Structure 1
Amino acid sequence: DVFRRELVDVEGIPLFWSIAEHWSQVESFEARPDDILISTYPKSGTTWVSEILDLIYNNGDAEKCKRDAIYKRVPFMELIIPGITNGVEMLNNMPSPRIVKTHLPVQLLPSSFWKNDCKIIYVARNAKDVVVSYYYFYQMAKIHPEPGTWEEFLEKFMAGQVSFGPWYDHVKSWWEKRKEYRILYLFYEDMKENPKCEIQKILKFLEKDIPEEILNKILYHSSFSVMKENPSANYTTMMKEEMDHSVSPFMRKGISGDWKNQFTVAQYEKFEEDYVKKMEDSTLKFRSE
């Protein structure tokens, strides 16, 4: 049973057993200078930005972006599950320009990305919304250990005892890294508020100037309501064994502020107190609504 196993520490970070088992393949991953790395803590907007990038790369052509599922168009690099997927191999076999997905904390990112000075788009999302999204994701995405109850999971998340480790360290270290490498550090909440502005930021970062009509096309097709229904983007093409959308759909709510629906007031206060301690010595700033 490849699913529901305990995570395995990889250089200090809990990862899926099969990622840990194939860690050398990941560590030695060969990046390319024109790779665009989409780097996120899980549930932070990876798919949204991946779709955007793929739409950009295909000039807003919806059909072209339906050539395959997002997880094939934008491979999850470190995700290696025997018999199921190998992000490294999928990427190795992908023509440039590659869009590369990762959730690795910065200290675990394969050094080739640094050596190739790749452009990286990091997406951060407020921790409270992340943990809620992650909770449901843990439930539906069977490669994860059992999340436990929301309460248990919340505690694991705060303790960083979740797949890919602590969100806090993830976002903070990636934020710090933006001083060393070309990281367009985006916030899920900003994409919610003004996706056009954020996509323009992506375009600028990518050094692409496209017609307003194409930008509007990209905006339309990267909206949650379009993506949710889009089988090439919404993970419903996943084997049910890997992702059971009947448990929780991948495209779950796609809002900011869902944490309000999940957190008890006590859990929220506790979370915030803990959060402040973990975050106050970082200049990184978020919105939760």
Structure 2
Amino acid sequence: TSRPPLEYVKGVPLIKYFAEALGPLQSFQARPDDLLISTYPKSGTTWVSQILDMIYQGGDLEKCHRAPIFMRVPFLEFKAPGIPSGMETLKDTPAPRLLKTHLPLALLPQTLLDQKVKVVYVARNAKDVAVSYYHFYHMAKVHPEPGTWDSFLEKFMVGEVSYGSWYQHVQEWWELSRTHPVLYLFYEDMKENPKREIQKILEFVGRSLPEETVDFVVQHTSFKEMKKNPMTNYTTVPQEFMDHSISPFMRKGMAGDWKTTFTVAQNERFDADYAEKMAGCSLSFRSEL
């Protein structure tokens, strides 16, 4: 139906369809040269996906327009009636392949860890993530009713949203980067200095580009450019899946705008809770630039 309730799998709340996609996924075979883009929802998946695809296409914009980003970078656990699962889309994806997922480590196909697949993880401060997720819940009909912002924020703090706990997600993948090749990025860093981050990515994937081509990538991976690029702004998907009139996928693309949504009371409650949850974590985020 519409806005169906989430379904729990191994302690993780998942969109019904995606939970179903986990069955077939057990057969997925990762290749040594795959590159997995991993993120907790709304942390910059699309953004880093466009960056990586441009790098992979040698900065050739025309090639990057060959199809929408969700087509160029198969969504691993994706599934929907009548549409090939991301796992199927991956059957005709040429190597080297770029893959996307939001799956907690507990649901991640073991094959990706055994094959030592290079991982590009992107994290974003929890407040901007929460707000971005609140609006995403509204336009992406596949999600359950978000309720009021206060109610959503409450569910967000206990990980009772699609894909579970933000706190758990950013922490476990941070810890994984110790026994697995993982480049851990920050949405805020990318906002601060795009080129600097794009250069780290280039080094991580062991590639090189002319200084001029890099500046070219920077420009076409900017919010302004990606907002207007129909191959990255998701405006080509059926309104039944994503309704941009309710809230555009490319919303604001800023770091620190959570401040116009969080009330003073919610902020104090959130900070308190946040300190307990991130206590023993060496990770350090920036709520604004």
TM-score by length of 1: 0.98
Aligned residues of 1:28 and 1:111 also touching (Cα < 8 A): no
In the alignment of these two chains, the number of paired residues is 288
Partner of 1:95: 94
Deviation of the 1:30 alpha carbon: 1.6
1:189 aligns with 2:156: no
Aligned residues of 1:35 and 1:118 also touching (Cα < 8 A): yes
Partner of 1:46: 45
Partner of 1:57: 56
Name the aligned partner's letter for residue 70 of structure 1.
Answer: I
What root-mean-square deviation, in Å, do the aligned CA atoms of Structure 1 and Structure 2 show? Answer: 0.9
List, as ranges, runs of 4+ consecutive aligned residues in structure 1 with deviation greater than 4 Å.
none
Identity between Structure 1 and Structure 2 (%): 60
Partner of 1:123: 122
Aligned residues of 1:178 and 1:185 also touching (Cα < 8 A): yes
Alignment of 1:1-289 (within 5 A): 1=1, 3-289=2-288
Secondary structure in structure 2 of the residue aligned to 1:28: coil
Aligned residues of 2:21 and 2:78 also touching (Cα < 8 A): no
Return the alpha-carbon distance in structure 1 between the equivalents of residues 29 and 237 of structure 2: 26
Secondary structure in structure 1 of the residue aligned to 2:133: helix
Deviation of the 1:27 alpha carbon: 3.4
Secondary structure in structure 2 of the residue aligned to 1:108: coil
Name the aligned partner's letter for residue 126 of structure 2.
Answer: A
Structure 2 residue runs of 5 or longer lacking an equivalent are none
Return the alpha-carbon distance in structure 1 between the equivalents of residues 24 and 182 of structure 2: 24
Tell me which moved more, 244-253 or 19-28: 19-28
Q: Deviations over 1:118-141 (max 9, x none)?
A: 000000000000000000000001
TM-score by length of 2: 0.98
Aligned residues of 2:68 and 2:231 also touching (Cα < 8 A): yes
Aligned residues of 1:40 and 1:123 also touching (Cα < 8 A): yes
Q: Deviations over 1:63-105 (max 9, x none)?
A: 1111111111111110111223411111122111111010011
